[PDB]
């Protein structure tokens, strides 16, 4: 017999296959609020669901924000009011998605980690850095400085734990270094800090890559190629 | 700016943001103002609802496919069925909204001389009844199948009397009408004969070229596939 928790996991896997990510995220949110820990697979379903939901809002926000900037420069005041209203509508959806994820992290996921659950901890602290970073993308002024500080602090603790307890080739540690370097470059406008982090992570991993099996190698190199592409774009731009 | 301009501006923004539910909701509100749609407005309404219904259609095919291969846990199958029903009811609501718009405002307010609008809207009516027929069963299926075919049949008669065989709307109608026969009616010979006669009538009379030839190529691909 399929229990209640497994019925929610079934809903989210079906929602994923149907590309119905609001449905997926709602199912994973409910799984989390059962106050039972998430397996490796469960965490990935949680992350996939909210990445797609917030990602759709971020993409729409960048398009409408770009139209808003162009409308303002042309001084079309009546049109700008209508564009601003839509950009703010999308922004509020984006912020609510982010606040929901952060509440799950603070009320459940990070809260229930024990100190030896290093993978869980890094995964969840990285994801709190990610969703504070998404809030930072749409904020300005003092509001922005608040979520930027929260993002950095989350990334920093995640990376200290990852360095102490994960191999440099581990895809979650690689993914965290990547997103942390992206934080420095796009959020803090700190190219040198960004490149230093990304290059340290790439070098630390590539020296131990030869010791992986074929599956683990593919996962690590995929992320390592991304570090490499950013390093190139960032040093040139 | 009045309501009409507010809504039109919202739907163009929604289009650019790829938020087709917002786009459709705005275009629905525009149509409900009971004023004619220009050609640009008509395409906004069509693009919006094609995308909304297409997401549901695509999701529905996935879960129904899982439901098929699920016969193999009574309780696991039950949740798959219930989810496909959830999607199915979303799809039916979308189709019925469109169909209500076409019947309450768009087709009704066509003047006898606006044959282009008439063909386009009745073709649209055939399309959304066909999307209902893709998921319906039993008696409800019979009703939407015959409603689909009656709409297509009327649009095709008007298009035959008032449009050249090279007209994109007439060719697009022949294409979808042939898909109705093939996919809904399981009538491949009737489907191939319609697609073949329309490609032939167009090629017999062939910048405007690129528009008609694009659809003629789709007719020929289906015929190549169906035979």
């Amino acid at each position: 017999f399929m229990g209640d928790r497994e019925q929610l996991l079934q809903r989210a896997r079906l929602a994923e296959q149907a590309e119905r990510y609001d449905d997926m995220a709602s199912a994973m949110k409910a799984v989390t609020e059962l106050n039972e820990p998430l397996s490796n697979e469960d965490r990935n379903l949680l992350s996939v669901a909210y990445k797609n939901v917030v990602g759709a809002r971020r993409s729409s926000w960048r398009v409408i924000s770009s139209i808003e900037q162009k409308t303002m420069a042309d001084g079309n005041e009546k049109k700008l009011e209508k564009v601003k209203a839509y950009r703010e509508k999308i922004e509020k959806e984006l912020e609510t998605v982010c606040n929901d994820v952060l509440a799950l992290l603070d009320k459940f996921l990070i809260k229930n980690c024990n100190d030896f659950q290093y993978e869980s901890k890094v995964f969840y602290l990285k994801m709190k850095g990610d969703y504070y970073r998404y809030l930072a993308e749409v904020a300005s002024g003092e509001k922005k400085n608040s979520v930027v500080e929260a993002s950095e602090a989350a990334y920093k603790e995640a990376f200290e734990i990852s360095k102490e307890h994960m191999q440099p080739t581990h895809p979650i540690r690689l993914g965290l270094a990547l997103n942390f370097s992206v934080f420095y470059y796009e959020i803090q406008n700190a190219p040198e800090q960004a490149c230093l982090l990304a290059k340290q992570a790439f070098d630390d991993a590539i020296a131990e890559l030869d010791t992986l099996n074929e599956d683990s190698y593919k996962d690590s190199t995929l992320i390592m190629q991304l570090l490499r592409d950013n390093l190139t774009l960032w040093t040139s731009d | 700016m009045g309501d009409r301009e507010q809504l039109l501006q919202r739907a163009r923004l929604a289009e650019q943001a790829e938020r087709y539910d917002d786009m459709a909701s705005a275009m629905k509100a525009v149509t409900e103002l009971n004023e004619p749609l220009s050609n640009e407005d008509r395409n906004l309404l069509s693009v919006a609802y094609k995308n909304v219904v297409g997401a549901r259609r695509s999701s529905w095919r996935v879960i129904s496919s899982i439901e098929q291969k699920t016969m193999a846990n009574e309780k696991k199958l039950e949740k798959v069925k219930a989810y496909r029903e959830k999607i199915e009811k979303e799809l039916e609501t979308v189709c019925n909204d469109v169909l209500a718009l076409l019947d309450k405002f768009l087709i009704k307010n066509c003047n006898d001389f606006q044959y282009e609008s008439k063909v386009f809207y009745l073709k649209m009516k055939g399309d959304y009844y066909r999307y209902l027929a893709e998921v319906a069963s039993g008696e409800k299926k019979n009703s939407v199948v015959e409603a689909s075919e009656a709409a297509y049949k009327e649009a095709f008669e008007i298009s035959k009397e008032h449009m050249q065989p090279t007209h994109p709307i007439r060719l697009g109608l022949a294409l979808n009408f042939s898909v109705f026969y093939y996919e809904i009616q399981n009538a491949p010979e009737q489907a191939c004969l319609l697609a073949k006669q329309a490609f032939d009538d167009a090629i017999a009379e062939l910048d405007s070229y690129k528009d008609s030839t694009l659809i003629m190529q789709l007719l020929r691909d289906n015929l190549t596939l169906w035979t």
Binding site: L178, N179, V182, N230 | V179, Y182, N222
Partner: peptide
């Protein structure tokens, strides 16, 4: 832009109806 980002066989599916 630069952060960590099979049904992607979708672009090869052929639609029968008008696009």
């Amino acid at each position: 832009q630069g952060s960590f980002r099979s049904q992607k066989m979708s672009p090869f599916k052929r639609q029968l109806s008008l696009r």
